[PDB]
Amino acid sequence: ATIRADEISKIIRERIEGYNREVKVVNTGTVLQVGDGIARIHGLDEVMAGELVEFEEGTIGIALNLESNNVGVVLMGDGLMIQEGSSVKATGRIAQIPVSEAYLGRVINALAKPIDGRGEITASESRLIESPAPGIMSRRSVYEPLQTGLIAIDAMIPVGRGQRELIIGDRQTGKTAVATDTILNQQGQNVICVYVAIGQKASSVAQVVTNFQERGAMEYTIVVAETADSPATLQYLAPYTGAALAEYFMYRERHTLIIYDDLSKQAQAYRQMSLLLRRPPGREAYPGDVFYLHSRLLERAAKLSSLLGEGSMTALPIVETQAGDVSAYIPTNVISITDGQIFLSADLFNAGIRPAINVGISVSRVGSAAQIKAMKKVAGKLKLELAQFAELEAFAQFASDLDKATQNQLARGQRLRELLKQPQSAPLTVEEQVMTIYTGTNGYLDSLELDQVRKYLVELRTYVKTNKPEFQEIISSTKTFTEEAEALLKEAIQEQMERFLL
Amino acid sequence: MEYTIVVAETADSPATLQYLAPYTGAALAEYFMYRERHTLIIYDDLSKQAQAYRQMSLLLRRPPGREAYPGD
Amino acid sequence: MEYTIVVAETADSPATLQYLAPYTGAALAEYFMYRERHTLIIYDDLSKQAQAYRQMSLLLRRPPGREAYPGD
Amino acid sequence: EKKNLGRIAQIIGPVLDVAFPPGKMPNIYNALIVKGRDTAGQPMNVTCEVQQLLGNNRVRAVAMSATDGLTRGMEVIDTGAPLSVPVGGATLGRIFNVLGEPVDNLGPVDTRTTSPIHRSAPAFTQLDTKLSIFETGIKVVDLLAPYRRGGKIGLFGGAGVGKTVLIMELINNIAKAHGGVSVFGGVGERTREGNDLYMEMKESGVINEQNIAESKVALVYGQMNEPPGARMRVGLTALTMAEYFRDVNEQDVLLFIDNIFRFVQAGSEVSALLGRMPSAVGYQPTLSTEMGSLQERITSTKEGSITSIQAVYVPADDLTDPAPATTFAHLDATTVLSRGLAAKGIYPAVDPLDSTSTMLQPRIVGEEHYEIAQRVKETLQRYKELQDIIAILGLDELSEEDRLTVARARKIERFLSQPFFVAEVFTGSPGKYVGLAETIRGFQLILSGELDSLPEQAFYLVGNIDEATAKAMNLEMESKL
Amino acid sequence: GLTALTMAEYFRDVNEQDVLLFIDNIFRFVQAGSEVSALLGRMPSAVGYQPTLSTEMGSLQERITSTKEGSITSIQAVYVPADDLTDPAPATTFAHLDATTVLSRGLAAKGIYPAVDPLDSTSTMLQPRIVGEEHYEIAQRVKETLQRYKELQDIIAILGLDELSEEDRLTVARARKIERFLSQPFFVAEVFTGSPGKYVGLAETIRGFQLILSGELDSLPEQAFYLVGNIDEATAKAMNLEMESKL
Amino acid sequence: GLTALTMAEYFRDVNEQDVLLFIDNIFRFVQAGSEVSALLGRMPSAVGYQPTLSTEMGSLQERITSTKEGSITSIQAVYVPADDLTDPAPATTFAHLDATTVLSRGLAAKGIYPAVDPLDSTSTMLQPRIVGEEHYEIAQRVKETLQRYKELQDIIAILGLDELSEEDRLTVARARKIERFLSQPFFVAEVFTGSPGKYVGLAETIRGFQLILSGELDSLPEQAFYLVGNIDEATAKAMNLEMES
Amino acid sequence: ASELAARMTAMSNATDNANELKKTLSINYNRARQAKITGEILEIVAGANAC
Numbered sequence A: 001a002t003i004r005a006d007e008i009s010k011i012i013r014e015r016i017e018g019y020n021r022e023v024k025v026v027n028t029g030t031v032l033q034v035g036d037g038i039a040r041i042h043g044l045d046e047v048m049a050g051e052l053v054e055f056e057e058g059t060i061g062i063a064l065n066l067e068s069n070n071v072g073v074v075l076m077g078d079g080l081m082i083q084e085g086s087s088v089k090a091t092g093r094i095a096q097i098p099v100s101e102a103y104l105g106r107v108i109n110a111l112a113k114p115i116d117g118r119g120e121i122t123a124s125e126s127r128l129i130e131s132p133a134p135g136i137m138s139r140r141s142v143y144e145p146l147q148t149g150l151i152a153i154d155a156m157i158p159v160g161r162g163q164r165e166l167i168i169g170d171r172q173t174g175k176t177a178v179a180t181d182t183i184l185n186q187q188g189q190n191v192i193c194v195y196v197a198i199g200q201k202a203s204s205v206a207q208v209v210t211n212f213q214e215r216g217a218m219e220y221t222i223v224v225a226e227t228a229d230s231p232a233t234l235q236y237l238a239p240y241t242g243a244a245l246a247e248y249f250m251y252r253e254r255h256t257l258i259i260y261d262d263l264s265k266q267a268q269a270y271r272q273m274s275l276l277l278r279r280p281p282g283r284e285a286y287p288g289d290v291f292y293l294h295s296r297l298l299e300r301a302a303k304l305s306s307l308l309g310e311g312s313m314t315a316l317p318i319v320e321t322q323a324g325d326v327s328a329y330i331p332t333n334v335i336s337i338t339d340g341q342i343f344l345s346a347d348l349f350n351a352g353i354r355p356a357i358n359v360g361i362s363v364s365r366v367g368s369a370a371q372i373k374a375m376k377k378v379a380g381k382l383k384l385e386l387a388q389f390a391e392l393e394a395f396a397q398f399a400s401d402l403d404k405a406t407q408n409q410l411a412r413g414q415r416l417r418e419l420l421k422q423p424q425s426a427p428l429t430v431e432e433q434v435m436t437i438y439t440g441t442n443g444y445l446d447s448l449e450l451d452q453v454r455k456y457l458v459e460l461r462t463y464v465k466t467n468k469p470e471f472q473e474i475i476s477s478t479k480t481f482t483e484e485a486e487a488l489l490k491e492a493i494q495e496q497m498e499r500f501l502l
Numbered sequence B, C: 001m002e003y004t005i006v007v008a009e010t011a012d013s014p015a016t017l018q019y020l021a022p023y024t025g026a027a028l029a030e031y032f033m034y035r036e037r038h039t040l041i042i043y044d045d046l047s048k049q050a051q052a053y054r055q056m057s058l059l060l061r062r063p064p065g066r067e068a069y070p071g072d
Numbered sequence D: 001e002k003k004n005l006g007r008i009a010q011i012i013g014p015v016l017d018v019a020f021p022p023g024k025m026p027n028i029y030n031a032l033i034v035k036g037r038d039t040a041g042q043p044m045n046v047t048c049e050v051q052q053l054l055g056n057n058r059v060r061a062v063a064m065s066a067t068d069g070l071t072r073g074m075e076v077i078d079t080g081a082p083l084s085v086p087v088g089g090a091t092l093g094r095i096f097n098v099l100g101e102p103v104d105n106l107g108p109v110d111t112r113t114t115s116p117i118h119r120s121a122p123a124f125t126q127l128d129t130k131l132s133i134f135e136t137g138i139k140v141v142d143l144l145a146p147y148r149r150g151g152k153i154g155l156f157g158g159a160g161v162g163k164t165v166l167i168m169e170l171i172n173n174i175a176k177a178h179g180g181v182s183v184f185g186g187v188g189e190r191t192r193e194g195n196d197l198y199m200e201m202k203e204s205g206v207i208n209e210q211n212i213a214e215s216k217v218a219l220v221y222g223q224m225n226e227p228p229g230a231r232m233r234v235g236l237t238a239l240t241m242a243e244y245f246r247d248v249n250e251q252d253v254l255l256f257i258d259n260i261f262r263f264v265q266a267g268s269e270v271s272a273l274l275g276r277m278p279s280a281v282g283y284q285p286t287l288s289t290e291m292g293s294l295q296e297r298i299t300s301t302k303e304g305s306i307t308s309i310q311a312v313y314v315p316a317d318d319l320t321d322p323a324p325a326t327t328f329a330h331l332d333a334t335t336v337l338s339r340g341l342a343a344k345g346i347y348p349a350v351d352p353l354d355s356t357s358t359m360l361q362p363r364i365v366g367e368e369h370y371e372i373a374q375r376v377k378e379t380l381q382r383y384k385e386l387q388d389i390i391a392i393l394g395l396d397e398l399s400e401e402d403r404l405t406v407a408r409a410r411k412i413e414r415f416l417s418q419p420f421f422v423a424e425v426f427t428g429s430p431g432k433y434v435g436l437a438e439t440i441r442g443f444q445l446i447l448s449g450e451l452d453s454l455p456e457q458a459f460y461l462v463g464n465i466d467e468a469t470a471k472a473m474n475l476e477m478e479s480k481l
Numbered sequence E: 001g002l003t004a005l006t007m008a009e010y011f012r013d014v015n016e017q018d019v020l021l022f023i024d025n026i027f028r029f030v031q032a033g034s035e036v037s038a039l040l041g042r043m044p045s046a047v048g049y050q051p052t053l054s055t056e057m058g059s060l061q062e063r064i065t066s067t068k069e070g071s072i073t074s075i076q077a078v079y080v081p082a083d084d085l086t087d088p089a090p091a092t093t094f095a096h097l098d099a100t101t102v103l104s105r106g107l108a109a110k111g112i113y114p115a116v117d118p119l120d121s122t123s124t125m126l127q128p129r130i131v132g133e134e135h136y137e138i139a140q141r142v143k144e145t146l147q148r149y150k151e152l153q154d155i156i157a158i159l160g161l162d163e164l165s166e167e168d169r170l171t172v173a174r175a176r177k178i179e180r181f182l183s184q185p186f187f188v189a190e191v192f193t194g195s196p197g198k199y200v201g202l203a204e205t206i207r208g209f210q211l212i213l214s215g216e217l218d219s220l221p222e223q224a225f226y227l228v229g230n231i232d233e234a235t236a237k238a239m240n241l242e243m244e245s246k247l
Numbered sequence F: 001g002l003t004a005l006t007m008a009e010y011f012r013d014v015n016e017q018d019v020l021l022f023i024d025n026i027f028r029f030v031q032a033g034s035e036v037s038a039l040l041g042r043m044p045s046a047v048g049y050q051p052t053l054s055t056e057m058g059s060l061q062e063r064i065t066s067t068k069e070g071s072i073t074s075i076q077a078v079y080v081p082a083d084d085l086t087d088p089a090p091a092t093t094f095a096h097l098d099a100t101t102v103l104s105r106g107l108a109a110k111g112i113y114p115a116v117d118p119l120d121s122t123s124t125m126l127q128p129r130i131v132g133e134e135h136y137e138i139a140q141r142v143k144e145t146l147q148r149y150k151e152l153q154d155i156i157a158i159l160g161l162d163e164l165s166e167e168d169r170l171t172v173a174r175a176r177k178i179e180r181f182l183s184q185p186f187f188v189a190e191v192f193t194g195s196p197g198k199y200v201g202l203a204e205t206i207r208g209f210q211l212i213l214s215g216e217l218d219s220l221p222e223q224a225f226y227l228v229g230n231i232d233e234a235t236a237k238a239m240n241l242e243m244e245s
Numbered sequence G: 001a002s003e004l005a006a007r008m009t010a011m012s013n014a015t016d017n018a019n020e021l022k023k024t025l026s027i028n029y030n031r032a033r034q035a036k037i038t039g040e041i042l043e044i045v046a047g048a049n050a051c
């Protein structure tokens, strides 16, 4: 560059005073050209590529790209109140973050700083940001299930602990209710969740953290929140720091669940952070590096084997398909990066189905291996039932017919699909959803109204556990839906059909 | 034609003059408007005028935006 | 085959060679065209020649144009 | 702040790169005024904002007024803080450009209390938990698609369709019902329409010619004459002029922005002028961060909500392209004003069917409100379906089961039209303000079916349900003659 | 282009005679400017041409004006690149060109040569006081009939040819006969058609279009109008075609 | 990619075996080139990639050649980005590859796995001397059927199926039967869903396609061939389908 | 009456199907417009510097 950044008059005076003289500046650098969130520093030759440099005001800067003289850094805070000529200092730790089990419940501002204000969290650091993702030998095939809570998801598109699974959708159609439902259902079985929100209007994330606080999940969850009004580098770093803050609990043999929120907004923060650098972009002006981005981000979320302790981190990123087009750039990118897709369609959520999951497109690459030995048979039968119903509804038989549906499969398929809708943020337990899936699966209840199958099954749910703890014990201990469980469930739902009739 | 100043700018006029023509006619009609007379200025091909501004600004090394039209 | 030269250029060639291959063929047929024989040249993937010339004239910092192709 | 004497080295278009002594440089977004000179002989100062630092003590700054005639090396003076906008009770009624000088020519504004343009975000200990909806004062809005108190609102409708009477009614109703106060902040407002709005305000009593600082609007007008720096920062000026209102008086402040796409267009101009590499379709790279800084300070803090209403002009009518996309990521309630409804005369012309709000859900509004709202929308859907077929068959020919649906849908579409507190100047109708309780009970009475025999025109241009029955019995009393 | 312009400008300054210059592929006079401008340091404009597209294109196409010593009639054959009608290199030439004749690939698709668009090929000389009232009314009726055919193309394409209106079916048959009849067998294109070239003045084709669109001879077969010099030639071709149909 | 290629090249060139290397997502190689040559200072190219997207990937593809010692049957799951083949990074892949199969997202959206597009998937080996005249003629006929289906897709758009005449309706029914039959429950997709895998040889699928294209199997509905292997098993599936009703 | 009602249900199916087609084609046209304009701007800006 003809206009080289380390050619300020004041700075080149420092070099011109000593040609081949007394030793260089070891860890003292003067900031210069601190503009588009990317400060540059003269000297500071001790800085490791990736070292975490500091400033005078107290703002933190990752030192990504050190050129010949200017060690260009990426300051994480706002670069507003920094003036040129200010001194900087590295600290000799490669992009670390203090992390501990005191974070469970806090609201972190992507720099391991609590933004709730009520106290400063202490820690034993032990953790880097850009750590190596677990190797191919350290990972094990996903086998343990994850009680997602939503009937549709945990029935047909199963999420397994250690299996990244994006929930791609459209704007203003769920995905945050779906993510918070997955977090909320993890009340009983211990997981150290991390709900890292990248692009969220601050009122939405405040509402979500308050909903957590009142429904109790704040005993474990970690809201690494970054507002939409945050410097682009913080919206870029927040999922990496969330992944490190959940990886600290993944390495010590404990299942975790991280949820990147609006991962399209994170890639949007990166295209901002790079088009300010004027590095060349690709399709839709993303700088092309978004794949390596979502690689460092999403390949460090899987189940480590028994060697390093059987830990896990499902990733559940939320790419917001702004277009409604699956074949955009960054949704296609994250679909290639993740182990499946849970498609939250827009037209269905406008049409009423509250978890807008449509199983036609939404598939889980971990498949039925991640489900329970109990739910696998009945969920396979239910998926085939929904295939039949989807055909019979999307296609002909509006005229009565040769095959004359609504008398073979159409009524039961409508009942099943209108059973799949959950209430807003009311997750179903494991045995509850197994019985609910079974009910419409083999065609037990077919001659109710399709209006209020939910309004019957609320009563059925409230009744079955209070009447027959044998069912809950069968599902809780053996984890297998026995024929004996089928029989006792038949009797329970018979008595509830009585209590409903009267 | 008694009352209509036809500010003509041929195409071989340089980029500056095609850029300046609407401003010239605006400065004439502005005087006539300030002295109580209702006017009516009819520009011709603002596509062509902003295209001439595009030319002169891309020559003048100003950074271009959408459709290579300059910033302003 | 006794009459058909084949100027063959692989993919592993430096992009100078995929730029010179059709010129090599054209001149080798030009000799026969001045030898009165009604020769015939067939280029294969002439998109690939312009693509390798794009490779060249973009590795020379000569500025690109439409579809990131170089100028001439 | 201090005489940070600098030279205006480079002047490209609006952008004017200034230099400084090596020690003291204003930080980013720090307003600096040049001690400029007019070619007519007046030392006119055009104010500027440092948008990008360029290293060699030279801060590239955009200009909030025309740079035509700015001499290179003219003394530029720092202010040490962002553009000091004269907030307070004083700025209640007058028209302001971005730097905060009253351009209506009435009088100088008391600059006693001034907050900077760039005050940062409020944290989560500041933002409010409960998601209370906003009882505006229009029956259509506060039944079918409620506006979120503390949240964003989008008026997709065009101009002339009735946007000005709608915003006037909203301002008068916020002054009347709550303790609130409105701040119209038109960004890139075309000065003809700006004067149209100002004169309609003055003729509506919303603001008083004679009584300033008791008015109910703080007009901040981004003209289009001004360089792209000004009609971009007018949004933030409105934001802080309303934020001081909420954080000094604890009142439900309104904030009307003219088209967010016009703000985003101004941002695109200013970024292309700065030369930073343009992003997708051509809006700036820092599009999401910029407009998030604009629209995240609009949040219900624990002092009092700053609920705003933002026009949105989608380009070529697609919500896909980034600027409407990064806007609709923010918007919490979107209500389109319909030209066909306006031509019919169902004022307000808000489309009852296509207007949607994320706040309509039951745990937010109330189970009864969500149920009656869903049933009203399903009834209006039935009516939009059968409007195809009553053209052919007629009301009596089709089934009497949903002929009642057609009749109730007529009664609903008529009941939605509210006589405003501003339409009096056009027709003399006195105007009725309708809270949520009244319209809820009235719509339950209409849709349930108690009022199946009342004439349709007894529901048109009426307020509560009791007043509607009063209009009906009035027509009955005149039916004898 | 400027060399040809200098020859014409001499023939219009000195010999005072109306010189007819032909330029073909004038778009190359902008493409070469692009290829040198990119190198010259001048920044790129829209889709990839030079920044001084308008000034250079005008600097050529403004010197061609009848200048009170003679009249330089010129016919530039612009190359609309890849049928990009919005491309700047033809878009700035549409401003300078009086009698634009937009030839369309979609009309050479069905073989109608020349593939001049009957709609878009428009002229500043189709005003009635300039051309003749009969000429103007017949051109108006032909262009309106072709616009009707283009608007009924979609109805024809999907919903069956018969399901449109019956008077509009008359308009469709009339439009078909018109858009075939406006095909000319050229003398220089005799090698591509195989048919001998036929020259027809304005009067004969005017009288032909009158009786064609007037519905009076709407009974001939369609191929009797295609690639035909004149209306009487079309009537004779209908005889020949109906004879060789049965025979 | 280069180290996989060298590993296979040592076992082909030296020890003379029929080495297979299944380089997965060779597009990621070109995208890594895009990363490095955006950061290496080299000038940018078409839409985002390096300038040498047809010489670095040329170096990867051209070293995989069946030499006189051994042959390298390589499979490369090249990944079109954003679902458009006209992209340059798989466009330069099309020129090098000779058994190109395009896995369109349409067929996987409809549920037909594998989603190999039947029109677009072509080969250099679909030749008379190479595969026999019968295989060639059947391939031509099924390509014709699917192409006419995709060409009157614009008519089984806005209008209905019943707008077609008899021959169009029959070729549409045949195309639906074929497009369904082109699905197969894989031997490794048993984890996702579907039946256990059915290995299908050429001599068995060629007979099923003779059968379907001879119109002799018109009595069967479309759901008979969906996710089945051999055509005798397809007919058995239809028989059990009618038994189950 | 039966023929005209068959034609009418064909028209209703065709109109709703063309509505679906118009929506999907508008989506394709919008992503095509964004892709075209973005590619244009990348051409222009990347050819501006030519360092």
Ligand SMILES: Nc1ncnc2c1ncn2[C@@H]1O[C@H](COP(=O)(O)OP(=O)(O)OP(=O)(O)O)[C@@H](O)[C@H]1O
Pocket: A170, A171, A172, A173, A174, A175, A176, A177, A178, A199, A200, A204, A262, A320, A353, A354, A355, A356, A422, A423, A424, A425, D329, D358, D359, D361
């Ligand atoms: N299953 C559901 N049932 C009822 N209401 C729902 C459901 N899911 C979401 N909502 C409503 O949607 C609102 C939350 O928005 P939603 O989760 O739909 O999109 P979002 O995730 O906020 O959008 P973005 O992805 O841009 O953040 C809540 O007010 C809630 O009432």
